[PDB]
Design an enzyme around this catalytic site. Structure first.
Site, PDB file in Angstrom:
ATOM      1  N   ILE A  92       0.869  -1.203   0.000  1.00 25.34           N
ATOM      2  CA  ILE A  92       0.000   0.000   0.000  1.00 25.34           C
ATOM      3  C   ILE A  92       0.889   1.230   0.000  1.00 25.34           C
ATOM      4  O   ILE A  92       1.865   1.235   0.751  1.00 25.34           O
ATOM      5  CB  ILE A  92      -0.871   0.010   1.256  1.00 25.34           C
ATOM      6  CG1 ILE A  92      -1.968  -1.039   1.152  1.00 25.34           C
ATOM      7  CG2 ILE A  92      -1.414   1.412   1.506  1.00 25.34           C
ATOM      8  CD1 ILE A  92      -2.847  -1.075   2.367  1.00 25.34           C
ATOM      9  N   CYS A  93       0.524   2.254  -0.765  1.00 21.03           N
ATOM     10  CA  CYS A  93       1.237   3.550  -0.742  1.00 21.03           C
ATOM     11  C   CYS A  93       0.736   4.365   0.456  1.00 21.03           C
ATOM     12  O   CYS A  93      -0.399   4.834   0.406  1.00 21.03           O
ATOM     13  CB  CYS A  93       1.080   4.299  -2.057  1.00 21.03           C
ATOM     14  SG  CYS A  93       2.083   5.801  -2.078  1.00 21.03           S
ATOM     15  N   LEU A  94       1.541   4.491   1.515  1.00 23.56           N
ATOM     16  CA  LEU A  94       1.134   5.257   2.726  1.00 23.56           C
ATOM     17  C   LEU A  94       1.218   6.762   2.407  1.00 23.56           C
ATOM     18  O   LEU A  94       2.246   7.177   1.799  1.00 23.56           O
ATOM     19  CB  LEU A  94       2.003   4.840   3.911  1.00 23.56           C
ATOM     20  CG  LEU A  94       1.779   3.407   4.397  1.00 23.56           C
ATOM     21  CD1 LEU A  94       2.835   3.013   5.433  1.00 23.56           C
ATOM     22  CD2 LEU A  94       0.378   3.236   4.966  1.00 23.56           C
TER      23      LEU A  94
END
Length: 162
Positions: A116-118
């Site tokens: 996931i791209c935080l």
């Protein structure tokens, strides 16, 4: 700060963590894992009380590899995804990378492996709170908001099916 109140509203009942220790740190890592499990189980218990029991996690013996399942309900249908992450050597100053492998290549909001791209906001928020946030906070502030945007989107686009 809206940011500060929004953070408190989400995490105020999650036990705060104390020990600055990563996986190599022997008896100090065992202590940090006690805090991690303490924080995770209280978060799960609060989630159950709120009709939002949305994940399960287990670790290997050394607490360096985490795996389990999260559930997202959309239009009363429940969608289950396998989740996993490694604990970085530099934990807890460095935040873990959450993978949802079945979503690998299904959204631009993820990089290779279904990591996931935080947000440019989640990482500095973690950084500002070191070492008080742990895996419960990663779930509450990282994965949770990700699913609440992406699962609806991917159902609408017909990428995710029930």
């Amino acid at each position: 700060s809206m940011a500060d109140e929004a953070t408190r509203r989400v995490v105020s009942e999650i036990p705060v963590l104390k020990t600055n220790a990563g996986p190599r740190d022997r008896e100090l890592w065992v202590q940090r894992l006690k805090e991690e499990y303490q924080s995770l189980i209280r978060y799960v218990e609060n989630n159950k009380n709120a009709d939002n029991d949305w994940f399960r996690l287990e670790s290997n013996k050394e607490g360096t590899r985490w795996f389990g399942k999260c559930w997202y309900i959309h239009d009363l249908l429940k969608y289950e995804f396998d989740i996993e992450f490694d604990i970085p050597i530099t934990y807890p100053t460095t935040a873990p990378e959450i993978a949802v492998p079945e979503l690998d290549g299904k959204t631009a909001k993820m990089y290779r492996g279904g990591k996931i791209c935080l947000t440019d906001h989640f990482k500095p928020l973690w950084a500002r709170n070191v070492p008080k946030f742990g895996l419960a906070h990663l779930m509450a502030l990282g994965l949770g908001p990700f699913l609440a945007v992406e699962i609806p989107d991917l159902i609408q686009k017909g990428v995710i099916h029930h």
